[PDB]
Amino acid sequence: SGFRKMAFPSGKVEGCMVQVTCGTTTLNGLWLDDVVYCPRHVICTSEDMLNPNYEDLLIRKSNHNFLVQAGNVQLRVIGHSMQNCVLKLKVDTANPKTPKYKFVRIQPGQTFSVLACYNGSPSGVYQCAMRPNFTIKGSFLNGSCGSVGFNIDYDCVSFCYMHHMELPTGVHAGTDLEGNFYGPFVDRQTAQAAGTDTTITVNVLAWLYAAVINGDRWFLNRFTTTLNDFNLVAMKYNYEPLTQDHVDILGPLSAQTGIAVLDMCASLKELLQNGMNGRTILGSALLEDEFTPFDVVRQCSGVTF
Amino acid sequence: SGFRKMAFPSGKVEGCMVQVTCGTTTLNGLWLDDVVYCPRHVICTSEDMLNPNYEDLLIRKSNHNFLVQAGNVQLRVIGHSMQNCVLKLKVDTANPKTPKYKFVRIQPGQTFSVLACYNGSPSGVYQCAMRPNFTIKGSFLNGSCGSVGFNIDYDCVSFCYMHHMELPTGVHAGTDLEGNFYGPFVDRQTAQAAGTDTTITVNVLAWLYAAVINGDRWFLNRFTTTLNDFNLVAMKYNYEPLTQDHVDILGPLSAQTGIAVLDMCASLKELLQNGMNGRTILGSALLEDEFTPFDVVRQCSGVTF
């Protein structure tokens, strides 16, 4: 037993990370088949980033302006195109390590693993949630752009995030692998507002189930609540409202623990209104919202890949 | 920027994970060159675990009683031997994916990445610290034995941990790769006392440095204290004593932030005596002690592998 914030094994993605250099800018790209995906602002100088006209900038580049490095072998760029905010550099070698993969656009509250890379070599791996305001709270230094987030389903890598930028507030923003930003953000170095962030209620509930399964029961009360009363308390504390879809997602955990979803909700209501009063839950003194109901079941069932 | 509990990329270790079956027991093993390393209690039934005679149990086993599977490939066992609490299975083929590697015995307070595996297949990766009492707080379901812990230096994998058991308190215990347990534990299902756990003071200080680097500064006071005065308070709060060695290890963080170690100590003292008063540091309501100073420096410079 035990419950940890855990990332997917990163080996399948490690084999896809290359280094993409355009002029003075070097970041990471994702090499799948004969195409390398990277943030389009690799074509930008630091001055360009203040107000880039990407189409004008890209026209100034030819294929030989892109230095793509996989390990020590240089790949030969034979085509380049822009899809929303990602560049697609067609190369002449298909990545022999290309895993089975999908591009997916995830929802607020869903989680994924980030393989943080620098100069095309993997540096570390950690699990993130897409915040309800479509930022992520990651760890990204200069050169980390192009690092990807992903989930794994046995042997298929679902890529869902490519890192593009750090907002002036230090939170992180990026795109799906079709280059569409998550949230209202643009790849321009300008002040950008992330909306109010909220707590992912369904994730907190799943983690409370994770806690019960691992023996932390103190927060359990025999009270109950209606979905409506809970959401009225939830919204006072900047918790996302809980829906029936969310109740349905939590079904399996309710069934394993014998704790109806709305009973858990009453225990969460109490925690928000009365605080945790110095005790902890799964070693945390705050309510955790970075575990989806699927993550809890997976970790508590031992799913492998 | 940002600061995350970050694990090493696991790809190099993934290629070494195999499934070892003996009789009715299946766990994981580590395939390096032509040797598979696994917990010796692979030869035990559940009832053997209550009081195993490992020498007598192993005498009844032959090479063909050990089924070793690497993916879909069946390895032929051509020799078996027990070293402390690990079985070494000689196989007829060298693992072509063997990284450069070392076997290392880490110190209490050092961190490592765990690649949790089931049936020889990697499940997740997370960062752990060797507690001062030589337990780890992991996530290990039935079948995870033989999962390994490791650090990576560029291209060299330092294997430091192999998982063997969960103590009745829920914490986890294991061995180095020569089969020597960390701590006073044995591979038998009995009540086993772990020492009093304590907080890894040098790691707390490192994490405070990480917080200052990330702009979390509210906890800085302008006080200083002495090493003995700090250690007086540390002992009262079940913190490990701070040594000059630890002060030395914190030097580079002290130099980058302009905050003398004994000044950070005074801040920590005040956090201990006054609590956090419900405030947070780096998104945590507790003092985090699972980042070494090397972890902190590494994450704030972007070392790669």
Coordinates of C-alpha atoms in Angstrom, one line a residue:
Chain A
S1 CA 0.0 0.0 0.0
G2 CA 0.9 3.7 0.3
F3 CA -0.1 6.5 -2.0
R4 CA 2.4 8.6 -4.0
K5 CA 2.2 11.2 -6.7
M6 CA 3.5 9.0 -9.5
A7 CA 4.3 9.6 -13.1
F8 CA 4.1 7.2 -16.0
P9 CA 7.4 5.5 -16.9
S10 CA 9.0 7.9 -19.3
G11 CA 11.1 5.5 -21.5
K12 CA 8.8 5.6 -24.5
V13 CA 8.9 9.4 -24.6
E14 CA 12.6 9.7 -23.9
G15 CA 13.2 8.0 -27.2
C16 CA 11.3 10.8 -29.0
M17 CA 13.0 13.9 -27.5
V18 CA 15.3 15.7 -29.9
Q19 CA 17.1 19.1 -29.8
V20 CA 15.8 21.8 -32.1
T21 CA 18.0 24.8 -32.8
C22 CA 16.9 27.8 -34.9
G23 CA 19.5 30.6 -34.8
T24 CA 20.2 31.5 -31.2
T25 CA 17.2 29.6 -29.9
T26 CA 17.4 26.0 -28.8
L27 CA 14.5 24.0 -27.3
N28 CA 13.1 20.5 -27.4
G29 CA 11.2 18.8 -30.2
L30 CA 9.1 15.6 -30.3
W31 CA 10.3 13.2 -33.0
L32 CA 7.5 10.9 -34.2
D33 CA 7.7 9.1 -37.6
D34 CA 9.5 11.5 -39.9
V35 CA 8.1 14.7 -38.2
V36 CA 9.5 16.7 -35.3
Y37 CA 7.0 18.8 -33.4
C38 CA 8.3 21.8 -31.4
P39 CA 7.0 25.2 -30.2
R40 CA 6.9 27.7 -33.1
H41 CA 8.6 30.4 -31.1
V42 CA 11.9 28.6 -31.6
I43 CA 12.1 30.9 -34.6
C44 CA 12.0 33.9 -32.3
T45 CA 14.8 36.0 -30.8
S46 CA 14.1 37.3 -27.3
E47 CA 13.2 40.6 -29.0
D48 CA 10.9 38.9 -31.4
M49 CA 8.9 37.4 -28.5
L50 CA 7.6 40.8 -27.5
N51 CA 5.4 41.0 -30.5
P52 CA 6.0 38.3 -33.1
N53 CA 4.4 38.1 -36.5
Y54 CA 5.0 34.3 -36.8
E55 CA 4.0 34.0 -40.5
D56 CA 6.5 36.7 -41.5
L57 CA 9.2 35.2 -39.3
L58 CA 8.7 31.7 -40.6
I59 CA 8.9 32.9 -44.2
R60 CA 12.4 34.1 -43.4
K61 CA 13.4 30.5 -42.6
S62 CA 14.2 27.7 -44.8
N63 CA 14.6 24.0 -43.9
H64 CA 18.4 24.3 -43.4
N65 CA 17.7 27.1 -40.8
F66 CA 16.5 24.3 -38.4
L67 CA 19.2 22.4 -36.6
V68 CA 17.6 19.1 -35.3
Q69 CA 19.8 16.8 -33.2
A70 CA 18.8 13.3 -31.9
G71 CA 21.5 12.2 -29.6
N72 CA 24.7 12.9 -31.6
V73 CA 23.1 12.2 -35.0
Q74 CA 21.8 15.3 -36.8
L75 CA 18.5 14.8 -38.6
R76 CA 17.9 16.4 -42.0
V77 CA 14.9 18.7 -42.2
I78 CA 13.3 18.3 -45.6
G79 CA 10.1 20.3 -44.9
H80 CA 8.6 22.7 -42.4
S81 CA 5.1 23.9 -41.7
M82 CA 3.2 25.7 -38.9
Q83 CA 0.1 24.3 -37.3
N84 CA -1.4 26.8 -34.9
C85 CA 1.5 27.3 -32.4
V86 CA 3.6 24.2 -33.3
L87 CA 6.1 23.8 -36.0
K88 CA 6.2 20.5 -37.9
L89 CA 9.7 19.9 -39.2
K90 CA 9.5 17.0 -41.7
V91 CA 12.7 15.0 -41.5
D92 CA 14.2 12.3 -43.7
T93 CA 14.5 9.7 -41.0
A94 CA 11.5 8.1 -39.3
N95 CA 12.2 7.8 -35.6
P96 CA 12.8 4.0 -35.2
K97 CA 11.8 4.4 -31.5
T98 CA 8.4 6.0 -32.4
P99 CA 5.9 4.4 -29.9
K100 CA 2.3 3.8 -30.7
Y101 CA 0.8 7.2 -30.0
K102 CA -2.2 9.6 -30.1
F103 CA -2.5 13.3 -29.9
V104 CA -5.3 14.2 -27.4
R105 CA -6.7 17.4 -26.0
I106 CA -7.3 17.0 -22.3
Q107 CA -9.9 18.6 -20.0
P108 CA -9.3 20.8 -17.0
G109 CA -8.7 18.7 -14.0
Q110 CA -7.1 15.8 -15.9
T111 CA -3.6 14.9 -15.1
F112 CA -0.5 13.9 -17.1
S113 CA 3.2 13.2 -16.8
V114 CA 5.7 15.8 -17.9
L115 CA 9.1 14.8 -19.1
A116 CA 11.1 18.0 -18.5
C117 CA 13.9 18.2 -21.1
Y118 CA 16.8 20.5 -21.8
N119 CA 18.7 20.5 -25.1
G120 CA 16.7 17.5 -26.2
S121 CA 17.8 15.3 -23.3
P122 CA 15.4 14.2 -20.6
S123 CA 16.0 15.8 -17.2
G124 CA 13.2 14.6 -14.9
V125 CA 9.6 13.3 -14.8
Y126 CA 6.7 14.5 -12.7
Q127 CA 2.9 14.4 -12.7
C128 CA 0.8 17.5 -13.3
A129 CA -2.8 18.5 -13.4
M130 CA -4.3 20.8 -16.0
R131 CA -5.6 23.5 -13.7
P132 CA -9.2 24.7 -14.2
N133 CA -7.8 27.9 -15.6
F134 CA -5.7 25.9 -18.1
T135 CA -2.3 26.6 -16.6
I136 CA 0.0 24.0 -15.1
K137 CA 2.1 24.3 -12.0
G138 CA 5.3 22.7 -13.3
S139 CA 9.0 23.0 -13.1
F140 CA 10.4 24.5 -16.3
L141 CA 13.6 26.4 -16.8
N142 CA 14.8 28.2 -19.9
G143 CA 15.3 25.6 -22.6
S144 CA 12.5 23.4 -21.3
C145 CA 10.1 24.6 -24.0
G146 CA 9.0 21.7 -26.2
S147 CA 8.9 19.3 -23.2
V148 CA 5.8 17.3 -23.5
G149 CA 3.1 15.9 -21.2
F150 CA 1.6 12.5 -21.8
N151 CA -0.4 9.6 -20.5
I152 CA 0.2 6.0 -21.3
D153 CA -2.4 3.3 -21.9
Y154 CA -0.4 0.0 -21.9
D155 CA 1.7 0.6 -25.0
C156 CA 0.0 3.8 -26.5
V157 CA 1.4 7.2 -25.6
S158 CA -1.3 9.8 -25.5
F159 CA 0.6 13.1 -25.9
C160 CA -1.6 15.9 -24.5
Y161 CA 0.7 18.9 -23.7
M162 CA 3.7 20.7 -25.1
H163 CA 5.3 23.3 -23.0
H164 CA 5.6 26.8 -24.5
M165 CA 5.9 29.5 -21.9
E166 CA 6.1 30.7 -18.3
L167 CA 3.6 33.5 -17.6
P168 CA 4.9 36.5 -15.6
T169 CA 3.3 34.9 -12.5
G170 CA 5.5 31.9 -12.8
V171 CA 2.8 29.4 -13.9
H172 CA 3.1 27.6 -17.2
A173 CA 1.1 27.5 -20.4
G174 CA 1.2 25.3 -23.5
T175 CA -0.6 23.6 -26.3
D176 CA -1.9 20.3 -27.4
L177 CA 0.2 18.6 -30.1
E178 CA -1.9 20.3 -32.8
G179 CA -0.5 23.5 -31.4
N180 CA -3.8 25.0 -29.9
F181 CA -3.1 26.6 -26.6
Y182 CA -4.8 25.4 -23.5
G183 CA -6.6 28.4 -22.2
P184 CA -6.6 32.1 -23.4
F185 CA -2.9 32.3 -23.8
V186 CA -0.7 33.3 -26.8
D187 CA 3.0 32.6 -27.5
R188 CA 4.0 36.2 -27.0
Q189 CA 6.1 37.7 -24.2
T190 CA 3.3 40.0 -22.9
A191 CA 1.4 40.2 -19.6
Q192 CA -1.3 37.6 -19.8
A193 CA -4.0 37.0 -17.2
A194 CA -4.7 33.5 -16.1
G195 CA -8.2 33.4 -14.7
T196 CA -9.0 32.6 -11.1
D197 CA -7.8 29.1 -10.4
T198 CA -10.2 26.8 -8.6
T199 CA -9.7 23.6 -6.8
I200 CA -10.6 20.4 -8.7
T201 CA -13.3 19.0 -6.4
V202 CA -13.7 15.6 -8.1
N203 CA -9.9 15.1 -7.7
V204 CA -10.0 16.0 -4.0
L205 CA -12.8 13.5 -3.5
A206 CA -10.8 10.8 -5.3
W207 CA -7.8 11.5 -3.1
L208 CA -10.0 11.3 0.0
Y209 CA -11.0 7.8 -1.2
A210 CA -7.3 7.1 -1.7
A211 CA -6.8 8.1 1.9
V212 CA -9.5 5.9 3.3
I213 CA -8.2 2.9 1.2
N214 CA -4.8 3.6 2.8
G215 CA -6.2 3.9 6.4
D216 CA -6.6 7.6 6.9
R217 CA -10.3 7.6 8.1
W218 CA -10.4 10.5 10.7
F219 CA -12.1 13.0 8.4
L220 CA -15.0 10.5 7.8
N221 CA -18.3 11.6 9.3
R222 CA -21.6 9.8 9.0
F223 CA -23.3 13.0 7.8
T224 CA -24.5 13.3 4.3
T225 CA -25.3 16.2 1.9
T226 CA -27.2 17.0 -1.2
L227 CA -25.2 17.7 -4.4
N228 CA -26.7 21.2 -4.3
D229 CA -25.9 22.1 -0.7
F230 CA -22.3 20.8 -1.2
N231 CA -21.9 22.9 -4.4
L232 CA -23.1 26.0 -2.5
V233 CA -20.4 25.4 0.1
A234 CA -17.9 24.4 -2.6
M235 CA -18.3 27.7 -4.5
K236 CA -17.6 29.7 -1.3
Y237 CA -14.2 28.0 -1.1
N238 CA -13.3 28.3 -4.9
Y239 CA -14.0 24.6 -5.4
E240 CA -15.2 23.6 -8.9
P241 CA -18.9 22.6 -8.7
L242 CA -19.5 18.8 -8.6
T243 CA -21.7 17.4 -11.3
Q244 CA -23.5 14.0 -11.7
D245 CA -20.8 13.1 -14.3
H246 CA -18.3 13.6 -11.5
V247 CA -20.4 11.5 -9.1
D248 CA -20.5 8.8 -11.8
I249 CA -16.7 8.9 -12.2
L250 CA -16.4 8.3 -8.5
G251 CA -18.7 5.3 -8.6
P252 CA -16.0 2.6 -8.4
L253 CA -14.2 4.2 -5.5
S254 CA -17.5 4.6 -3.6
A255 CA -18.2 0.9 -4.2
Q256 CA -14.8 -0.4 -3.1
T257 CA -14.9 1.7 0.1
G258 CA -18.6 1.4 0.9
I259 CA -18.7 5.2 1.2
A260 CA -21.3 6.8 -1.0
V261 CA -20.1 9.7 -3.0
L262 CA -22.4 12.2 -1.3
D263 CA -21.2 10.9 2.1
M264 CA -17.6 11.7 1.1
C265 CA -18.9 15.1 -0.1
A266 CA -20.3 15.8 3.4
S267 CA -16.9 14.9 4.9
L268 CA -15.3 17.3 2.4
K269 CA -17.8 20.1 3.3
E270 CA -16.8 19.7 6.9
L271 CA -13.1 19.8 6.1
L272 CA -13.5 23.1 4.2
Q273 CA -15.7 24.7 6.9
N274 CA -13.7 23.5 9.9
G275 CA -10.2 23.1 8.4
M276 CA -7.9 20.1 9.0
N277 CA -7.1 21.3 12.6
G278 CA -3.4 20.3 12.5
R279 CA -3.8 16.7 11.4
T280 CA -2.9 15.4 7.9
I281 CA -4.3 13.2 5.2
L282 CA -1.9 10.9 3.3
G283 CA 0.9 13.0 4.7
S284 CA -0.5 16.3 3.4
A285 CA -1.7 19.2 5.4
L286 CA -3.7 20.5 2.4
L287 CA -6.4 18.9 0.4
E288 CA -4.8 17.5 -2.8
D289 CA -6.4 17.9 -6.1
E290 CA -3.8 16.5 -8.6
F291 CA -5.1 12.9 -8.5
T292 CA -8.0 12.0 -10.8
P293 CA -10.4 9.2 -9.9
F294 CA -8.7 7.2 -12.6
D295 CA -5.2 7.9 -11.1
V296 CA -6.4 6.6 -7.7
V297 CA -7.9 3.4 -9.2
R298 CA -4.8 2.8 -11.3
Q299 CA -2.3 3.3 -8.4
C300 CA -4.5 1.3 -6.1
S301 CA -4.9 -1.5 -8.7
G302 CA -1.3 -1.7 -10.0
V303 CA -1.9 -1.1 -13.7
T304 CA 1.3 -1.6 -15.7
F305 CA 2.5 -0.7 -19.2
Chain B
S1 CA 10.8 28.2 -12.8
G2 CA 8.6 26.3 -10.5
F3 CA 9.6 23.5 -8.1
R4 CA 8.3 19.9 -8.3
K5 CA 9.1 16.6 -6.7
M6 CA 10.8 15.2 -9.8
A7 CA 12.0 11.7 -10.5
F8 CA 14.7 10.7 -12.9
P9 CA 13.7 9.6 -16.4
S10 CA 13.2 5.9 -16.0
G11 CA 13.9 4.6 -19.6
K12 CA 17.3 3.1 -18.7
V13 CA 15.8 1.2 -15.8
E14 CA 12.7 0.1 -17.7
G15 CA 14.9 -1.9 -20.1
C16 CA 16.3 -3.9 -17.1
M17 CA 13.0 -4.9 -15.5
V18 CA 12.1 -8.6 -15.8
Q19 CA 9.5 -10.9 -14.3
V20 CA 10.8 -13.7 -12.0
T21 CA 8.4 -16.5 -11.2
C22 CA 9.3 -19.3 -8.7
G23 CA 6.6 -21.8 -7.9
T24 CA 3.5 -19.7 -7.2
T25 CA 5.3 -16.4 -6.5
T26 CA 6.0 -13.8 -9.1
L27 CA 7.8 -10.6 -8.5
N28 CA 10.3 -8.3 -10.4
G29 CA 14.0 -8.7 -11.0
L30 CA 16.7 -6.5 -12.4
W31 CA 18.5 -7.9 -15.4
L32 CA 22.1 -6.4 -15.8
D33 CA 24.6 -8.1 -18.1
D34 CA 23.8 -11.9 -17.7
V35 CA 22.6 -11.7 -14.1
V36 CA 19.0 -11.2 -12.8
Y37 CA 18.7 -9.7 -9.3
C38 CA 15.5 -10.2 -7.3
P39 CA 14.4 -10.6 -3.7
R40 CA 15.2 -14.0 -2.3
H41 CA 11.7 -14.3 -0.9
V42 CA 10.6 -15.1 -4.5
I43 CA 11.2 -18.7 -3.3
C44 CA 8.7 -18.3 -0.4
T45 CA 5.0 -19.0 -0.2
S46 CA 2.9 -16.7 1.9
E47 CA 3.2 -19.3 4.8
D48 CA 7.0 -19.5 4.3
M49 CA 7.1 -15.7 4.8
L50 CA 6.0 -16.2 8.5
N51 CA 9.3 -18.0 9.3
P52 CA 11.5 -18.7 6.2
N53 CA 14.6 -20.9 6.3
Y54 CA 16.1 -19.4 3.1
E55 CA 19.0 -21.8 2.8
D56 CA 16.8 -24.8 3.2
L57 CA 14.2 -23.3 0.9
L58 CA 16.8 -22.5 -1.8
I59 CA 18.3 -26.0 -1.6
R60 CA 15.1 -27.4 -3.0
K61 CA 15.2 -25.1 -6.0
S62 CA 17.0 -25.8 -9.4
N63 CA 17.7 -23.5 -12.2
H64 CA 14.7 -24.6 -14.1
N65 CA 12.4 -23.8 -11.2
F66 CA 13.1 -20.1 -11.9
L67 CA 11.1 -18.6 -14.8
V68 CA 12.6 -15.4 -16.0
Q69 CA 10.7 -13.4 -18.6
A70 CA 11.9 -10.1 -20.2
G71 CA 8.9 -8.8 -22.1
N72 CA 7.8 -11.7 -24.3
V73 CA 11.3 -13.3 -24.3
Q74 CA 12.0 -16.2 -22.0
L75 CA 15.5 -16.1 -20.5
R76 CA 17.2 -19.4 -19.6
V77 CA 18.5 -19.6 -16.0
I78 CA 21.9 -21.4 -15.9
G79 CA 22.9 -20.6 -12.3
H80 CA 21.4 -19.4 -9.1
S81 CA 23.0 -18.1 -5.9
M82 CA 21.9 -16.1 -2.8
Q83 CA 23.8 -13.0 -1.6
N84 CA 22.4 -11.8 1.7
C85 CA 18.7 -11.2 0.9
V86 CA 18.9 -11.1 -3.0
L87 CA 18.9 -14.0 -5.4
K88 CA 21.3 -13.7 -8.3
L89 CA 20.1 -15.7 -11.3
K90 CA 22.7 -16.3 -14.0
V91 CA 21.0 -16.3 -17.4
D92 CA 22.3 -17.3 -20.7
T93 CA 22.1 -13.9 -22.4
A94 CA 23.4 -10.5 -21.4
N95 CA 20.8 -7.8 -21.3
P96 CA 21.6 -5.8 -24.5
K97 CA 20.0 -2.8 -22.8
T98 CA 22.2 -2.8 -19.7
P99 CA 23.1 0.8 -19.0
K100 CA 26.3 1.8 -17.5
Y101 CA 25.6 1.1 -13.8
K102 CA 26.8 1.0 -10.3
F103 CA 25.5 -0.6 -7.0
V104 CA 25.5 2.0 -4.3
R105 CA 24.4 2.1 -0.6
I106 CA 22.9 5.4 0.1
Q107 CA 22.8 7.3 3.4
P108 CA 19.6 8.1 5.4
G109 CA 18.2 11.4 4.0
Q110 CA 19.4 10.8 0.5
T111 CA 16.8 10.6 -2.2
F112 CA 16.2 8.3 -5.2
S113 CA 13.7 7.5 -7.8
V114 CA 11.6 4.3 -7.6
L115 CA 10.3 2.6 -10.7
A116 CA 7.4 0.7 -9.3
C117 CA 6.8 -2.5 -11.3
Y118 CA 4.4 -5.5 -11.4
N119 CA 5.0 -8.7 -13.3
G120 CA 8.2 -7.2 -14.6
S121 CA 6.4 -4.3 -16.2
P122 CA 7.0 -0.7 -15.1
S123 CA 3.9 0.9 -13.6
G124 CA 5.0 4.4 -12.3
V125 CA 7.9 6.4 -11.2
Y126 CA 8.2 8.6 -8.1
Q127 CA 10.9 10.2 -5.9
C128 CA 11.5 8.8 -2.4
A129 CA 13.8 9.6 0.5
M130 CA 15.5 7.1 2.8
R131 CA 14.1 8.1 6.1
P132 CA 16.5 8.5 9.0
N133 CA 15.0 5.3 10.4
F134 CA 15.8 3.5 7.0
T135 CA 12.3 3.1 5.9
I136 CA 10.8 4.7 2.8
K137 CA 7.2 5.9 2.3
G138 CA 6.5 4.4 -1.1
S139 CA 3.6 3.0 -3.0
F140 CA 4.0 -0.8 -3.3
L141 CA 1.1 -3.1 -3.9
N142 CA 1.4 -6.9 -3.9
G143 CA 3.8 -7.9 -6.6
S144 CA 5.9 -4.8 -6.4
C145 CA 8.8 -6.6 -4.7
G146 CA 12.0 -6.4 -6.7
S147 CA 11.1 -2.9 -7.9
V148 CA 14.3 -0.8 -7.7
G149 CA 15.4 2.6 -6.6
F150 CA 18.1 4.5 -8.5
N151 CA 19.8 7.8 -9.2
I152 CA 21.2 8.7 -12.6
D153 CA 24.4 10.7 -13.3
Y154 CA 24.3 11.6 -17.1
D155 CA 24.6 8.0 -18.4
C156 CA 25.4 6.0 -15.3
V157 CA 22.6 4.4 -13.3
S158 CA 23.3 4.1 -9.6
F159 CA 21.0 1.4 -8.2
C160 CA 20.6 1.9 -4.5
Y161 CA 17.4 0.2 -3.4
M162 CA 15.5 -3.0 -4.1
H163 CA 12.0 -3.3 -2.5
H164 CA 11.3 -6.3 -0.3
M165 CA 8.5 -5.7 2.1
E166 CA 5.8 -3.6 3.7
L167 CA 6.0 -3.4 7.5
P168 CA 2.7 -3.8 9.4
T169 CA 2.8 0.0 9.9
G170 CA 2.5 0.5 6.2
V171 CA 6.0 1.8 5.6
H172 CA 8.4 0.0 3.3
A173 CA 11.8 -1.7 3.7
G174 CA 14.3 -3.1 1.3
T175 CA 18.0 -3.7 0.5
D176 CA 20.8 -2.4 -1.5
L177 CA 21.7 -4.5 -4.5
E178 CA 24.1 -6.6 -2.6
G179 CA 21.0 -7.7 -0.6
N180 CA 21.8 -5.9 2.7
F181 CA 18.7 -4.4 4.2
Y182 CA 18.6 -0.8 5.0
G183 CA 17.8 -0.6 8.7
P184 CA 17.3 -3.4 11.2
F185 CA 14.8 -5.2 9.1
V186 CA 14.6 -8.8 7.9
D187 CA 12.7 -10.5 5.1
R188 CA 10.2 -12.2 7.4
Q189 CA 6.6 -11.3 8.0
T190 CA 6.8 -10.4 11.7
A191 CA 6.2 -7.2 13.6
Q192 CA 9.4 -5.2 13.2
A193 CA 10.1 -2.0 15.0
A194 CA 11.4 0.9 12.9
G195 CA 13.4 3.5 14.7
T196 CA 11.8 6.8 15.7
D197 CA 11.6 8.7 12.4
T198 CA 13.0 12.2 12.3
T199 CA 12.9 15.1 9.9
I200 CA 15.9 15.5 7.6
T201 CA 17.0 19.0 8.7
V202 CA 19.5 19.6 5.9
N203 CA 16.8 18.7 3.3
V204 CA 14.3 21.1 4.9
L205 CA 16.9 23.9 4.7
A206 CA 17.5 23.0 1.0
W207 CA 13.8 23.2 0.3
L208 CA 13.6 26.6 2.1
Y209 CA 16.4 27.7 -0.2
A210 CA 14.4 26.4 -3.2
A211 CA 11.5 28.4 -1.9
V212 CA 13.5 31.7 -1.7
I213 CA 14.7 31.1 -5.2
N214 CA 11.1 30.7 -6.4
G215 CA 10.1 33.9 -4.5
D216 CA 8.5 32.4 -1.4
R217 CA 10.1 34.7 1.1
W218 CA 7.5 35.4 3.9
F219 CA 9.4 33.0 6.3
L220 CA 12.7 34.9 6.1
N221 CA 13.5 36.9 9.2
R222 CA 16.7 38.9 9.7
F223 CA 17.7 36.9 12.8
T224 CA 20.6 34.5 12.9
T225 CA 21.3 31.8 15.4
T226 CA 24.2 29.5 16.3
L227 CA 24.7 25.9 15.2
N228 CA 24.3 24.7 18.8
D229 CA 21.3 26.9 19.4
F230 CA 19.6 25.7 16.3
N231 CA 20.4 22.1 17.1
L232 CA 18.9 22.6 20.6
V233 CA 15.6 23.5 19.1
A234 CA 16.0 20.9 16.4
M235 CA 16.2 18.1 19.0
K236 CA 13.1 19.3 20.7
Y237 CA 11.2 19.1 17.4
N238 CA 12.6 15.6 16.3
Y239 CA 14.8 17.1 13.6
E240 CA 18.1 15.5 12.8
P241 CA 21.1 17.6 14.1
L242 CA 22.7 19.9 11.7
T243 CA 26.4 19.3 11.2
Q244 CA 29.2 21.4 9.6
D245 CA 29.1 18.8 6.8
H246 CA 25.5 19.8 6.2
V247 CA 26.3 23.5 6.4
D248 CA 29.0 22.8 3.8
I249 CA 26.6 21.0 1.5
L250 CA 24.3 24.0 1.6
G251 CA 27.1 26.4 0.6
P252 CA 26.2 26.9 -3.1
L253 CA 22.5 27.5 -2.2
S254 CA 23.7 30.0 0.5
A255 CA 25.9 31.7 -2.1
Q256 CA 23.3 32.0 -4.8
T257 CA 20.6 33.4 -2.5
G258 CA 22.9 35.5 -0.3
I259 CA 21.3 33.9 2.7
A260 CA 23.8 32.5 5.2
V261 CA 23.0 29.0 6.4
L262 CA 22.8 30.1 10.0
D263 CA 20.3 32.8 8.9
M264 CA 18.1 30.3 7.2
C265 CA 18.5 28.2 10.3
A266 CA 17.0 31.1 12.4
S267 CA 14.1 31.2 10.0
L268 CA 13.6 27.5 10.4
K269 CA 13.8 27.7 14.2
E270 CA 11.0 30.3 14.1
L271 CA 8.9 28.1 11.8
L272 CA 9.4 25.3 14.3
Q273 CA 8.5 27.3 17.4
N274 CA 5.6 29.2 15.8
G275 CA 4.3 26.7 13.3
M276 CA 3.4 27.8 9.8
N277 CA 0.2 29.4 11.1
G278 CA -1.7 27.9 8.2
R279 CA 0.5 29.6 5.6
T280 CA 2.2 27.7 2.8
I281 CA 5.7 27.4 1.3
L282 CA 6.0 26.2 -2.3
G283 CA 2.4 25.1 -2.2
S284 CA 2.9 22.9 1.0
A285 CA 1.5 23.4 4.4
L286 CA 4.3 21.3 6.0
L287 CA 8.1 21.5 5.9
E288 CA 9.2 19.2 3.1
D289 CA 12.2 17.1 3.8
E290 CA 12.4 14.9 0.7
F291 CA 14.7 17.2 -1.4
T292 CA 18.5 17.0 -0.9
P293 CA 20.6 20.0 -1.5
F294 CA 21.7 18.3 -4.7
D295 CA 18.1 17.8 -5.8
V296 CA 17.5 21.5 -5.2
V297 CA 20.6 22.6 -7.1
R298 CA 19.9 20.1 -9.9
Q299 CA 16.3 21.3 -10.4
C300 CA 17.4 25.0 -10.4
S301 CA 20.1 24.5 -13.1
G302 CA 18.5 21.9 -15.4
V303 CA 20.9 18.9 -15.4
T304 CA 20.2 16.4 -18.1
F305 CA 20.9 12.7 -18.9

